[PDB]
Structures are given as structure tokens and as C-alpha cells.
Amino acid sequence: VDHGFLVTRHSQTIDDPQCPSGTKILYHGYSLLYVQGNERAHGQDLGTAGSCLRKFSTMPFLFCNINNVCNFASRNDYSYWLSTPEPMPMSMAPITGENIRPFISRCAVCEAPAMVMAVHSQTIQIPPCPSGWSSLWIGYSFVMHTSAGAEGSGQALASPGSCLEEFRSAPFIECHGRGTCNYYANAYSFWLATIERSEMFKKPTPSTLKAGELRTHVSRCQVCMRRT
Amino acid sequence: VDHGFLVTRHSQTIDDPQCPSGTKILYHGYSLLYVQGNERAHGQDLGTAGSCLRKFSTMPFLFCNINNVCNFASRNDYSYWLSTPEPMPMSMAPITGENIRPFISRCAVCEAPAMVMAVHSQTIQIPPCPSGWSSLWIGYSFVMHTSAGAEGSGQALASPGSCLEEFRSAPFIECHGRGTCNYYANAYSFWLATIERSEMFKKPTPSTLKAGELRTHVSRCQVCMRRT
Amino acid sequence: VDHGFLVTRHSQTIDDPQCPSGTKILYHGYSLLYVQGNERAHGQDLGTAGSCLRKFSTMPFLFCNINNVCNFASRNDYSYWLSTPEPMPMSMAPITGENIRPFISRCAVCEAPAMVMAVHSQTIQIPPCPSGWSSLWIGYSFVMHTSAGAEGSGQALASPGSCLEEFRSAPFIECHGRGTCNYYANAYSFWLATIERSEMFKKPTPSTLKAGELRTHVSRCQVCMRRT
Amino acid sequence: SVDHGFLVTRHSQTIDDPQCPSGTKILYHGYSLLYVQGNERAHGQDLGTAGSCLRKFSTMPFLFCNINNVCNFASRNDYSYWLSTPEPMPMSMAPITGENIRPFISRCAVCEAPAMVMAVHSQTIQIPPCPSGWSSLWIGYSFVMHTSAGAEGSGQALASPGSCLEEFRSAPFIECHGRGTCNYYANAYSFWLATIERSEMFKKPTPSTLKAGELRTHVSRCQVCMRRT
Amino acid sequence: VDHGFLVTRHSQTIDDPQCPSGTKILYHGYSLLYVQGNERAHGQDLGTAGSCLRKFSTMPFLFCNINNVCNFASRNDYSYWLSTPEPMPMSMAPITGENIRPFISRCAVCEAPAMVMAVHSQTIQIPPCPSGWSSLWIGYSFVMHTSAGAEGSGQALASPGSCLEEFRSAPFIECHGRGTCNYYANAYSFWLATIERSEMFKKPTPSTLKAGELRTHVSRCQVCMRRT
Amino acid sequence: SVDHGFLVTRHSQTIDDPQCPSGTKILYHGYSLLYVQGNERAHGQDLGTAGSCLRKFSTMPFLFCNINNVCNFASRNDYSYWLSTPEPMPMSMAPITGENIRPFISRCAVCEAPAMVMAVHSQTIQIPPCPSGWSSLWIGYSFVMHTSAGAEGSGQALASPGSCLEEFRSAPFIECHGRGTCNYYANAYSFWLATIERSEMFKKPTPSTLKAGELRTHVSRCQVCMRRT
Ligand SMILES: [Cl-]
Ligand SMILES: [Cl-]
Ligand SMILES: [Cl-]
Ligand SMILES: [Cl-]
Ligand SMILES: [Cl-]
Ligand SMILES: [Cl-]
Ligand SMILES: [Cl-]
Ligand SMILES: [Cl-]
Ligand SMILES: [Cl-]
Ligand SMILES: [Cl-]
Ligand SMILES: [Cl-]
Ligand SMILES: [Cl-]
């Protein structure tokens, strides 16, 4: 008996990701991370179908007031999408129109025969799946993010959405109602850090890491599914 | 075998909603959207039992400090509830006492034999349920809301709570610890917008819509349950 | 057939909690409530495995910027953990190193045969589980919390995380990247309040409560699992 | 008598330049800037000071720069806010652009004064008298703060002429964007000092909801005054 | 020639403060610190006449919307006033009506012959006035404050408002539109700290201070006027 | 002539003391404080006022007290922000501590003036002339606001000398912490008044992204002026 358990997967590229072994495709879409309306951020759990929308837009929502008037793309609102490895233009100027497409991640919504969860090692080692559970994928421990106005959202640490397959310092792009997208200097990604068991309660040693050593302090994860 | 999957439904009226096809009643209540304490908003997923409380109050919570003192209805805190089609009084003054009753939406918490999800078309078209899933209800794509201090919360786009059966410009009412409720000019509802496939990457065309044309730009949704 | 449903339980003590009736242990850990990075709070549902981390740290995360530079414990960021009955030191000075250990709650992540939920009475009386659901535990209705910058997070009222077995005016402690933990005067806990059925729509009667009468206005809850 | 260079700014709340009040002299005119909002953070100008009077209007009067030595102008989602005129919203209620913005923007004068200038507030429907030895520049209504997008905003110093607006307006300011649009939005709030009777100071305030024809019954009055020399 | 320079003084008691030597009285009032409307704080400079209102109220302002409707004391807004040495009631419950009077500070707005400024020692010693400037009063260096929502305001360090004559850990009280006032556990005062010249560019030594030793780390100030 | 005690503060944006402008005399020197952030809320000092000039630097120049009569100094996660020098970030990009912080911190002078001091802004690349009867103190770039941690920050009064920085810097301030560290962070933004053409005031602004070598092509100029006596 298939009960309709769900798992969402994000390619972090322009390609449709395959559903992991033992699961089946329902539909593909574009990777929505969060929206920002009237300055207030609201995010989707990356492990859930709500992060996977059939249609992209820089402005995928509208707002309505108590006077029964609705406004679409008519203020200063934002959308944020998981992004591909596509580099910023040399100009560093905002991206518009069809030029936006190579920057947006794709996703799969998959039906699973059992419950799906994430486990985190908090080390450079891959955490094993709990006894009785098999592996769907391995990745990096993704916890939260901020951009405009230091607003943002985050992930549930037991959800597959907290286990991104590709580590990226800049895993999302910012888009506006006016039709532009860009990366901005205030965009932060937050990842679970590595911790040695002996050192749990001791003062953390501050570290600043550069390209080539970023993942030396990033926790690893595995997305697992109950064997039936 | 029943595993205890749940779905919550909101009437957006004074009457109890009926449980959708193939599900059974657990209990009814009043439709809690969010609370705001010490200026900070915290919302409930409208698809979960947490948005359905047995008892209403303008102040359904209290707060406690590190000095072991608790305070109930003794500051400037808020509660927010899904509302009915009841219009504002002519006076536009705050509503009190038994006069609040006609304004508050009812809900049903129902047990389901399988997982329940929402899908969104992002068009005026009704999106079909995935193959193998049956229809529970059809509605309008509800994403987030803001009120006092531009604080608020939103819905999980995979949850039944992101699919409201009646579109309303003003779908919720603001209540206070002091016992008053009202609609305020800064109350905003946010809904997923309609997008044309060929125009996904193009600049959104701004639109200001009035009564009669509001739903011409509102995404449709369907709530679905795996057939067993 | 075991589908891999999950329930997380928090001892609110230095000891591992036992898995509730009819469930089995997956792993134990420390009780993570929320994190705060670049001043923005992000919480974990206390009913989910995300609130149960194998390894403690005052700084369990790092951040990365668009210039491919990551920083660990190198700004002014926070972590928050459910706490034990351990009193503040007489000095009221921040706690460091091994002295932190007696303050941090433990958790168990447990595999269940069926779905788990919480129900709330909104009275001093115990709410019964729905028919066909078995009792896992009884507690107090925990909704929301705030600390530094009045930032915080909250619980899903349908989740076991909204049902804490021991009432505490101060149920959580604040930790910092610099390695210190403490209770601060601005730490607030929010709980569901008691409501009389006949008085639902009436003006709430304000009340200030001291030690000995704190629980007289705190809603009770029960955590329930579908009988299979 | 030495002129030390005391300043007072006046706002017409119309498309026409205001005149400098009696006993003061014009320095320059401009447009009435209320506040700006960059990276979601509001920062306001005291309406009594020359900082609220800019020579050139724009929907985007500022740019931002980052630690990587890159600056961006009108290239995100930032705002500017200006005191507005009696011009009504178009019936479409759609954002205003280009030259259609001009009728909505208030004008200002920066004036040199021979002495210090202050505002006083009655907290009644009556005009408060100037202090002994001070003469009147203008009368108006007690303006304290305002909010718009994200409930961000700013306010006035109650001793400043900026807290004393000559025309009462439920909606005294308009919102503009980097993209070139301006509009009134349903979340735009103006805050004014209320009328308080001396007998009711330490009594529970009586809640009141007021409509057109009735609004100013609860709005505090003010006078802007200048020391006689 | 008297040019009309102003200085405002706060008694921090129920008594009218006297205008300092060389100055003359214009009027007296009650000490307004800040207001909070639609959750946004806006403060008055304590050295200026704007912090001295003729009439007290728990709600000294109203708000108006774009529909030409104004609301007075009809939501959840705040006012904050400098307070007296009057202790919190034993009950710790909100204070109403005439009972508020013993808690509210008084002020004087005074005309001065010349400019007035504050200087700060950043030591426990009184800083001398600049040469050519004479003393108005001495005090403690007051910088900022926070209360509900961790909103607040602060003082200009060149203003007499940054130099409070009486040190208080809780120098202000919180009032509400509903007519209640109280001290709350999240109310913070911030003061300039004592810094020794040779320790300026060293790691600050953390310190937690109790009653009897609070002022050992509080910077002193003097308010001065140019001799003419 | 009677000296009434008008004040003007100047910031070197270097480790050298700035000189008081001609016509003014020194009161004292110090370090350039921009703003503080306590319990996550920012509060700034007007850079034109003596409040922005503290005798003694510290990474933590304040403490906080609670209603239980307990005060805490450098015992949470609070911040201070200071105007900075041309000193580059170290190659490691790691937090700076101890005496190594000194090369990064700007110095300031508090000066007594015989008359009122103001700023004017051109909103072009040209220097705006002082008003009639006002003499020049310095020229600079129009600085309006700034943000850092939590997108909190503060700004300048556009009539104040604080809105007129003598040296343009994309990163004009550094962030320090109660724990004793300072650094530049990727989210630190500076906001400057932009150049506006008179013919383009009401038109849609043209978006621009500028790199090193062209940053100042869109930054407004200013002059700080003093009334002649
Ligand atoms: Cl928009
Ligand atoms: Cl940027
Ligand atoms: Cl309340
Ligand atoms: Cl309203
Ligand atoms: Cl840190
Ligand atoms: Cl504290
Ligand atoms: Cl912009
Ligand atoms: Cl609107
Ligand atoms: Cl109110
Ligand atoms: Cl409290
Ligand atoms: Cl600190
Ligand atoms: Cl950084």
C-alpha cells in the first residue's frame, strides 16, 4: 500500500533532477526558496512540494487590501530562488528577461513508499542512515539564509531540504517585481558546522575560510528512507 | 490500516465545514491564523490541527519571565483569526464582546486514510491532482499575510492551508488582549499570481485590480489525497 | 509494515528521555530550540528530529558570503537550547566551558508505527486523545518564545513540540559564538491560556501571577498516536 | 544686531513655493523630502531643517556602495518618501510615473532667521500661545511620526517647526520607488498629537474612531515661534 | 541680545526641576521619552523641549489612514515616560488612572543666553567643562533604551539629554493606549561605560554588576554653557 | 563680538587629528563614533555633532542594565561602529584585535564656531556654492545613511556637516564587538546622495552599476558653510 509520502529534490542546475531510487516522479518545476512582501519574508521547506513551482516569475505573487483592491508587481517586493553555478555577468549589473533562465534551479516532486528524513554528522564524514533506513542522497547541512533587510528563512533539520547535494557559498538569487535578478553583497548562507565530540562544551575556535578550504568546516548529511 | 493522517478545513463562515470526501471528523473549532507577542508574529499552518482551536479568545495565550512571573492580557499583544463575510460596522470602530462571534471562521480537523497535498496552477486553470490522487477540494492560492508592524506569517505551498476555498481581499481579523477586534488599513493578504508560460522570464506587467476583476490574476489550487 | 513515522521527546534534564509507549529509539541528542544569525532567528519544531542534535556547541553553525569566504564563530551570533532545572550561578555572570553541560536538555528521536499529534484543552483539565488514538504523554501548551532583539520562534500546535512535559517560566538558555551562555531578563516564554467556554467572546480579565499560581492559567495538552 | 545664521524650513504642502515667514529671508527653495528607505531600513529628515528640502526631486535620490568597491544606483528595491499635495489618487489607483508625479510633490523654502525658532503644542483644539518674548511665524497641527512599507518610518522633533504642519492631512506623504513609480498605499499611517483635557490626563483614554468632517476634533494644535531681538 | 537658546531639564521625580543658574523658565511639563505606533518607535531628544509635554496621557497621539479615518486609543500602541524612584507595586500588576501619577517624571523648558552641551569622561570622575564654558549640572552618561519588541530610541551624546542627573537601572516606564502602565522584564537602559586610556585597544573585561556596584562602570558627564 | 558657543565636528577618516576649519578653534579631539547596536537595535550619532567624537575608543563603549538592578558590560553579543581609515583588510580576512585595531579607526575634532554651520548639496558632480553671506569650511561627498549587522543602521541630517564626508569611501566604517574583535563584513552598505539632472527629475531613473574608477561619477557633492559675522 502506497500512502503518498513525498520528497522534493533540487538539482541546483538547469537540469530536471531524477527522483531517487525507489521513488517516482509526480512533476518537475523551479526551485522557490522564499518570498518577501511588504518587507516580510516567508519561506518554503526545500524538502516539500511547496518549494517546487511549475512556473517561474520574478513576481509570483500579488497583494490585496481591505478596500478590495489588489496590486500585482506594483510596489517593491521580492522573490528568491535556488540558483545554478552560472557566473554573474562581468558588469555585475542586474539580469533581466530570458537572461534569467540559466540562473534558476530545477526541482522534482517525488512520491515515496515510506517516510523520508535527513540526518547530520556535524563532521566532514557522511552520517550513516538509521538502522532499517536506506540512502536516497548525500549532501551538505543547510540551515538558513538572509538577504535584503537581513530578512530570510530556513530549513527543518529533519527535512531533506536541509541536505543540499551541492555546496554553494551563494546558493540562491534575488529577484524583484520590476523584473530584475542579481546577487547582492549582503546575501548570506548558513550551514551546520563541524564539531569534535571532545570539544562540544569548549569555546569554539574562530575560523575564516577561503576558496579551497570552505568545506573543511561544513557538516555533511544523508537523506534516508525507511525500508518496507 | 489507518495511520492517522490529518487534514484541516476552514469554512470562512460561522458554520462548521464538512470533512472532505473519504475523511472523517475528529473535532471542530475556530480558525486561528497567528499570534503576536512582544511584537513578534508566530503563525499556524492552516492545513494542520494547530490552526483549529476548540475555544476562541481575543487573548488565547500568556507570557512568563525569568523572575517566575506570568502576565495574562496585561500588555499590548494580538491574536489573528480567519474571518467570515460579515461586513465592518458603519462606525468602523473596534468590535467587542458577543458582537465578535459573527466575524470568526470555523474549522474541522479530519482524519484521512492517506497523505494529503496541495498543487497550484499559477493560472486561472484548475490544476489536476497527480495521477493516483483523488480530489478533496478546489480553491485559491494563499501564500502570506501582514498586519500590525508589518508582522505576519504564511502557508506551506504543499499544505491544504495554502488553498482557501473562498477568495477574500481581507481574509482575517485582528484581535487584542484588551478585548477588541477590527479590520485595519494595513492588513494585507498575499496570493500566488497568474503567469503565462511563454512570459515566465519576461518583465511582469504591473496591474491594479478592482472588485469584479480581482480573481483574474489569482492562481487556482487543488487539494488531493493518495488513493488507497 | 513500519513506514518510519517519527516522534521527538525532550527530557528538560541532563538525562536521556525514554521513547514513548509503542515507539523505538533511533538516537539521542541535545535539545536545540533555535539559532540566530545576522540578527535573524530560525527555529526547529520541537516535535521533529531537527530539534535533536547529536553534538552540542554554543556555535553549531557558520556563514558564507558571495565572495566565497566563510566565517565560523567570528561575529555576534547565537544559539538557543531547551534548559534543565539548574539554577543561575549566584554571580549571574555568563557560563562557559564544561559548566554549560548541566544546563542543556537532552532528547530522544523515536520511530513510531503511526502519526503523532498534540491536542490542547485551553483549560486546567487534561484534553482526551481523539477516539482510536493512544496516549504518549501529558504536558503544558507551549506556543512561542523571544529573547535577544525580541527575535524568536514557536511551535506548531498540532505537533508534540507544543506539549512540554514540565512547565518552566524560563524553559530555554541563550548561547553565543564567543562561548558564553546565560539567562537574560528579556527572555519570554509564551503558553496557551485557560478560557471558560461561556466567556470566550468576553473581554479577557487581566492577571499577573506569581510562583505558586503560575499553572492556574496554563492550558494543558496530551500527545497522541493513532492505534494500529 | 549680528546675524548668526539661524535656519527655519517651511513646507507649502502644494506645488507652489512657500514664502519665508515674517522676519526671515530666503536662501533657496526645493522639494519636501520626508525619508528614505534603503536595504529595508528607514532614515528620516527633520522637517524643520534644511535636510528636508532638496533642490532636485527624484524617485531615487540616493545610491549604495559595498565593501567590494561596487556601487548600485536604482538597481534593487529601495524607496523615497516626500510630503504631498491635495492632488487625489487617479481613479485607477495604479502607480504614478514620469511627469504625472509632479502634481503630487510638496515644495519647501529654506529661510535664514535672526534668532532661534521653536514649536509649541497645546494638546487641545486651541492655538498655544508663543512663550513670553517670542513672536509667531505660523500656526498648524501637531505631527509626530509616520509609517509605510514594512511599517518602517521616522518622526519629528516636537520642539522643531517640522512637528507643526500648516495643513492637516490624513495622508500627508507619498511613497516613491527606485523603479520610478509613486503611489499612496493602504498601510501608510500618519501620527498626530491628540487633544487631552487636563482633568482627563490620568484617566483611561476614551477610544474614538473619527471620519471626514470630524478628524480635527481630536488633533493637537501648534505654533511656530521665534525669539524677539 | 538673547537669541533664544533652549535647555530642557528632567527631575526624575514628581517635583518640577529648577532651571539651572543663568537660565529662565518658559514652562513645565511631563517627561516624554518615546512613542511606539504600529510597532515602530520614535523618540524625543531629552535635552530638547520636545521631551517636555504640558499634558500627560498613556495615549498622547492618534493615527490616520489614507481612507480619511482616524483612530485614537483604538489599537495596541505605546508611550514611554521618564520615571521616578516609586517602586513597582507588590502585585507587579499594571497601574491605571491616578495611580500612574507617582511614577511620572517632571520637566522644565528653560531659555539660555548661549549654547548648551554635554561632555562625557568615560570614567567615574566628572569631566571638566571646556575652557570658556560653565557648569549647569553633572550626571550619568545615558545613551539608549529598549522595551517592547526591542524597539526604542536614544540620546545625542552632545545633548544635555545624554546626561541624566540620577542614575537608574530602570529610568523609564511603559504605558498603553488601553490606559495601563508598568515596568517589564525586557526593559533595558544603556549607559556609556568606564574606559581607561591604556585599555582602549584591549579586549574588554566582561563584568556583571549587582546593586551596590552598578555605578563603578558608569561614565560621568557634565552639562555646560558658554560664558557670554 | 560675543561668542555664543556654536559647534562643528570634523572627521579626518585617518589616524591623524583633523584640523579645525579656519575661523574656528579647538575644544578637544577623539575617535569617530558612528553608531552603537545593543539588544540588536541601532542608535547613531550625527557626524556633525560632538556626540560622534568620543575621547576614548573601545570595541564596547557601553553597558546595559535591567529592572532587577543588574548591569552587564561586554557580556552578551553587542556592537559598536566607527568611521574608518584607508587601512586595508588583512589578507586572512580574519577579525582584527588589540593594538592592531588602531590603524583602522578615524579621528575627530570638536571645534567652537562664531556662527551657525550648515551643509548644502548639489546633487551633481559639481561643488554647490555656499548661500549668500556664508563662507566655506570644507567640501566633500553627500553621505546619507548606512547599514551593517541585521540590516540595522542609522544616518545623517542633510543640513548637518555630518552629511558631508571629505573622503569618499565605499566602506567608510568598521564593525566592532563586545568580545573585542573588529572587521569589515560583506553586508556593510554605505548610502550616498546620487547625481540628478534637472531635466530628468520626474523621469524613470536610469539604473547604473559602477566599478572602481567610476564610483564618484554618480555621487553628489557638498559644501560645509558658516555664516559670516
Ligand atoms: Cl513589486
Ligand atoms: Cl551589492
Ligand atoms: Cl495583552
Ligand atoms: Cl486603520
Ligand atoms: Cl559568532
Ligand atoms: Cl539581562
Ligand atoms: Cl532601487
Ligand atoms: Cl495598497
Ligand atoms: Cl492604542
Ligand atoms: Cl514582564
Ligand atoms: Cl557584548
Ligand atoms: Cl562577511
Residue numbers in the entry:
A (entry chain C), B (entry chain A), C (entry chain B), E (entry chain D): 2 to 229
D (entry chain F), F (entry chain E): 1 to 229
From the paper:
Basement membranes are extracellular structures of epithelia and endothelia that have collagen IV scaffolds of triple α-chain helical protomers that associate end-to-end, forming networks. At the C-termini, interactions occur between the trimeric NC1 domains of two protomers, forming a hexamer of these domains reinforced by sulfilimine cross-links. Recent studies in one of our laboratories revealed that the NC1 domains function as recognition modules, directing the selection and assembly of α-chains into protomers and networks.
